[PDB]
Nucleic acid binder design. Structure first.
Lengths: 74, 109
DNA sequence: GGTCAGAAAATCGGTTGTGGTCAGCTGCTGCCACCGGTTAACCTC
């Protein structure tokens, strides 16, 4: 439960477009993930632009400056 | 002395019971022979069969008259048919008429 | 001794393209579970 709350906080530390992109990518709002072009359709840009945003956002989350609170949750 | 371990056949998850963003649900209605509705909440993306088992005791059919098909039911092993598989018509009718003649001569005199 | 103009970045975003890879789908491939017919073993008409 504390992991879910910390995940929500760190997910909300970044902006809403990439936030909802990650949420739709992993089903953190519904329990069902979407295709890349599905997320691109429901946002408004192409899926490759979506993939670039997703990859750089995944790197930003991977960075230790935001991985401090999730370093040892495993 | 004797301390064991064990578990029932089943695993346990840990989720949160949110009650808003559920799957879209179609509610289907069935009916038994004796006027017994059984409301069946399916998914909204779900095929609805015409028949469904209920707690009433039988397979209650749909409340629609759309699928009324009663066709495929028959008793495959009747004593008359398995008599016919071993005994011929003339032999059986001869036995029948002999017993009819016997009971005519018995009751009549 | 100012002055539009061009060259050349980068930056978000399409595009194409294409290549592959895999989820799955599904008709053969073949083996595997009841079903019962038959075939040599027991009791004495």
């Amino acid at each position: 439960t504390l992991l879910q709350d910390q995940l929500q906080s760190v997910l909300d530390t970044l902006s809403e477009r990439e936030a909802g992109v990650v949420r739709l990518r992993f089903g953190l709002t519904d329990g069902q993930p979407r295709t890349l072009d599905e997320i691109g359709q429901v946002y408004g840009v192409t899926r490759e632009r979506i993939r670039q945003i997703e990859s750089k956002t995944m790197s930003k989350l991977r960075h230790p400056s935001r991985s401090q609170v999730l370093r040892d949750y495993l | 002395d004797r301390v064991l371990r064990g578990s029932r056949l089943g695993a346990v998850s840990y989720e949160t019971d949110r009650n808003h963003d559920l799957a879209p649900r179609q509610i289907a209605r069935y009916r038994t022979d004796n006027g017994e509705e059984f409301e069946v909440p399916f998914a909204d993306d779900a095929e609805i069969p015409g028949t469904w088992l209920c707690r009433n005791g039988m397979e209650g059919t749909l409340i629609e008259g759309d699928l009324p098909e009663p066709k495929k039911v028959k008793p495959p092993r009747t004593h008359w048919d398995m008599l016919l598989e071993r005994r011929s018509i003339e032999e059986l009718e001869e036995l029948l008429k002999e017993r009819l003649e016997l009971i005519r001569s018995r009751r009549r005199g």
